[PDB]
Ligand binder design. Structure first.
Ligand SMILES: [Mg+2]
Ligand SMILES: [Mg+2]
Ligand SMILES: [Mg+2]
Ligand SMILES: [Mg+2]
Lengths: 165, 165, 165, 164
């Protein structure tokens, strides 16, 4: 669905990992660390978004190594991991590029994402985000976490800039 | 749907792993041992529950270091792995904290869980639990095993205590 | 649903692996070999069946150690792997135990299973089996392949024998 | 068949991997490399098609040895990998066998597949292909990417050849 926001002023998109770029339910590695998922259609749009000049960030509380490598390989340079207080890292990201809050989209799925979602210009969440998160979101994707909700908003922003084709 | 029970009486929540906190269908590791899944929304609620003073136990026949690690990383201290007859680990958990049965929730999915479910105050099960288990459950989650039925009940109990942050 | 057959007469149950006890869509191991999935509810019933004196076989074109190890661990001794022409292995299984066709259930999902299904007394298939297989099946499980169709039929047969609870 | 095309004309089927023969959402290997999925019903039909003399190609931007070995093991002899320019793989595949466009089916799921789909005779896509891909597809499978959309078209073509 189209987002209730002037997407033309979005210059940056930030994402939670678990329940957003990765599925909420994932296999467990023998090591005890979650084996995350990535969505290939998410991937296409994200690498394109980086090529077209949008600042992309991931902000996660874990040390999700495999996710770091994958998105690094997509050109994403702002990878905030072990983010115990996400709002502090969001601020770092915003200020690093001299952005205003109204220029940043953030997509989260669970309560540790709420503080950022309250400060960012365009809070978004997947179709299966928790109710507390849906109530703070300006847009709720048609797609569940890990299954194309990233592709959804990235494609919308790129199209609105005429940078999709 | 709220659980038909006075959740303020619940001081402890115990979970089967396979089919409850981990999906019923899982990848088979090349070793021939099943690879459990974890749900990150479950995880958030579980770790918060521990912090808020709810007692949390997992009780599983499984012996994999992955499951032990993952739950110990959430602050679960009562990890009953390699469980042969679950009722004993249930009693152990109950008695360790001076609980009565009516103060304990147990969530199971299959026949080996029935004995504990008959004894605990608040038996539940996921949406896709087996008939005999649904039969004895006071509450059936809206979520399938591994897909957030853990999150469901932990949150409900935390909310009823005024501890849902 | 329930099987339209006199299950008290069934003395043995044989299963294809891929697409029946394992999902049709599976992760690809880096070695180039498809991984398999297993279902924990299938497992409980299968190990129970062996304990209740029912003859259990798997008949698969696959050859992976993981599959062999997993089913052996459930106590399954009739492991027909690398099965190129399944009818030979079905007949070997039947004649091994002096069974007649009407005493054997076989569950398959694809064309290579059809010959065995035409011969066994009780051919079954998962909900997502191919239409040619559904055409020869006397029973279609409510469950997709890998997701509990094994449990479905094993449990029905054990209950018929009064060997469930 | 239920595809609106004379499938007996199709002599070759080419498939994108990710989002078509492998699922769109996949597990991540600890190396940071996505782990593809395969569908066992796709597999049976693919190996049969090869046996019945249909030309099969897989066209993918990836380079993983796993996808290489798997499809090789199914008898697939035309494995286009490491590719970025899909139209070139398609044209090379077509010309290798002296085919005309109308004799080739191609199934893709995303924007980079569009150029090929506009050139091939029978462009198909999975049920969850992006909307731009759906608008150029002659046929949209009932199956999601990685979940039997390959089996769908291969089987329909083999049936129309009387080779099923
Ligand atoms: Mg999250
Ligand atoms: Mg269980
Ligand atoms: Mg099969
Ligand atoms: Mg693709």
């Amino acid at each position: 669905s189209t987002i209730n926001y002037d997407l033309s002023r979005i210059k940056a998109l930030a994402f939670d990992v678990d329940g957003v770029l990765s599925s909420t339910t994932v296999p467990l590695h023998p090591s005890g660390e979650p084996m995350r998922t990535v969505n290939i259609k998410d991937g296409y749009a994200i690498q394109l978004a980086v090529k077209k000049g949008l600042h992309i960030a991931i902000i996660t509380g874990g040390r999700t190594e495999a996710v770091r490598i994958r998105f690094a390989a997509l050109g994403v340079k702002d990878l905030y991991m072990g983010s115990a207080v996400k709002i502090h890292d969001y601020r770092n990201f915003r200020d690093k590029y001299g952005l205003s809050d109204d220029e940043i989209l953030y997509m989260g799925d669970d309560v540790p994402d709420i503080e950022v979602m309250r400060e960012c210009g365009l809070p978004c969440c997947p179709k299966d985000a928790v109710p507390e998160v849906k109530s703070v979101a300006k847009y709720i994707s048609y797609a569940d976490g890990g299954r194309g909700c990233g592709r959804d908003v990235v494609e919308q922003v790129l199209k609105a800039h005429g940078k999709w084709m």
